[PDB]
Subunit: 116 residues, 4 copies
């Protein structure tokens, strides 16, 4: 699995469950082409977005739909989403974990990049 | 000052100086129209982006050029930029501060929304 | 002002007001001797803790009473307090700002060390 | 496993390996009694600190030896350590994950608490 997303909820001290995630890749014409999407599991993790063959070099955007998450919990948050934009696989294939820690008016994101 | 941006550097424990910041407002056709921009000061702050008259309700994007910041310091970063997307609301308090804390592979952002 | 503390609330997007802060200095026998204390202001800030003459090199602990803060707001928190322990160095820049961003089950802290 | 610690490095985008961790528990006399210790693995994770039988109700301190970590990488950081202090098991046994994201002048910590 070359691209995994993990989301935590800093209000409840729990995984952030059922968070929608949309991944885009910048096309030759500089538009964002949908690439993959999914939603976090009961563990806060989203696996299976893509394959090693499909996940070529490029600029990717991982959109985490934080507003939709909070509004389901009846909470009115600040951000529309949390966006993570990065160049991937420019020195060959790597495995990426994008992590995000959510609060209503804040978020933190980090990346763990490993070479298989 | 309805909108201020502050950027800090978690590697050196310092303001993040001379960071380019671009602000956009979402147009009716869902594109991002340039709205304001500047470079953070010696204190990591960017003031004077807009006025009360011009800063109407709507969705805004603040794009912080973190990659150029790290590259100018000789450091290899993960993200292309940090993006903060939010809705300005007239019901809420008047003044918005968007703060960002930068590391090479991670950033945190929060919003402080206050009244005078 | 050699030492300032700033506290923000990530649930409401606001300064964290009326937070008790206690500062200690490590004594030669390795105990923590009271040094300074106060409550954050309406802006989330605590100034005037010490003077240049009194703030000599050594190890200091800043203890932010986050549990009482959340309890006064009717919210159930994880931590007893947030502790920030660091060495003051005269080689480094003069002025220390300790900032903390609070959520019920998470906090972030950074140091900004600058010269005038 | 009722108490697990995970540490990430925000400069390298990697697990923080070989981080020493010391856990203490407040005694009846209000001193901190050593409780358990260990060091993070190649995954940044520390398992096996304690057992369900041993991990009774109490106030615990998880000390993460961040200064020793950075100084091994030849880096001179701000904090002496990152301390996480919390009441555990006060509504019966729970499983705790303490996570920390490290930079030289900052850290973030969160807790995930689950009911088995
Ligand atoms: O917000 C401030 O003025 C200073 O303190 C902070 C700065 C940042 Cl960038 C973050 Cl994420 C949190 C705090 Cl408390
Ligand atoms: O889950 C981990 O990999 C470690 O804990 C964290 C989780 C999140 Cl979501 C974030 Cl943003 C940081 C850390 Cl250290």
């Amino acid at each position: 699995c070359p691209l995994m997303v993990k989301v935590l909820d800093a209000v409840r001290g729990s995984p952030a469950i059922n968070v929608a995630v949309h991944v885009f890749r910048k096309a030759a014409d500089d538009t964002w082409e949908p690439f993959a999407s999914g939603k976090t599991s009961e563990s806060g993790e989203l696996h299976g977005l893509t394959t090693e063959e499909e996940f070529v070099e490029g600029i990717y955007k991982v959109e985490i739909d934080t507003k939709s998450y909070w509004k389901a919990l009846g909470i009115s948050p600040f951000h529309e989403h949390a966006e993570v934009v990065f160049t991937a696989n420019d020195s060959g294939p790597r495995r990426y974990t994008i992590a995000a820690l959510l609060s209503p008016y804040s978020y933190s994101t980090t990346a763990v990049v490993t070479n298989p």
